[PDB]
């Protein structure tokens, strides 16, 4: 994969990791807890889909399951495999700003950037990268 996006919904409920390719499309969708598993099993046609649309489906599905309401928190973290592809990184941060701007009035959005090294420590703890910097 080119990069890994995690989304953690609420103060501590569904947790998923998106693996993305060079075209910013979601190629892997990994639940990290049981609530994240119900979400992923409801999301339809996410393979090769632009990650901004998959975020839309995840947040909609979390709201419909009762995991988010207005003014609640959404935490996104991004890890890059190729630390030296700054062009890719700039494009993701641009697209993440489009995502957070779209939701700034409904949810409190937090977008963090981490690294593989931290992601492996989070994986050894069985939790999302994002939830690990918050731990």
Curated annotation (Swiss-Prot):
KO phenotype (gene knockout): Cells lacking this gene exhibit normal cell morphology and growth rate at 37 degrees Celsius, however cell diameter is slightly decreased.
Biased composition regions of type Basic and acidic residues, renumbered to the chain: 116-126
Localisation: Cell membrane
Domain of life according to the entry: Bacteria
Regulation: induction: Part of the sigI-rsgI operon, which is transiently induced by heat stress. Expression is positively regulated by SigI via the sigma-I promoter. In exponentially growing cells, expression is regulated by the WalRK two-component system, which represses the sigma-I promoter and activates the sigma-A promoter, leading to the formation of a basal level of RsgI. WalRK can also positively and directly regulate transcription of the operon under heat stress through a binding site located upstream of the sigma-I promoter. Repressed by glucose.
Subunit structure: Interacts (via RsgI N-terminal anti-sigma domain) with SigI.
Function description: Anti-sigma factor for SigI. Negatively regulates SigI activity through direct interaction.
This protein's name: Anti-sigma-I factor RsgI
Originating organism: Bacillus subtilis (strain 168)
Taxonomic classification: Bacteria, Bacillati, Bacillota, Bacilli, Bacillales
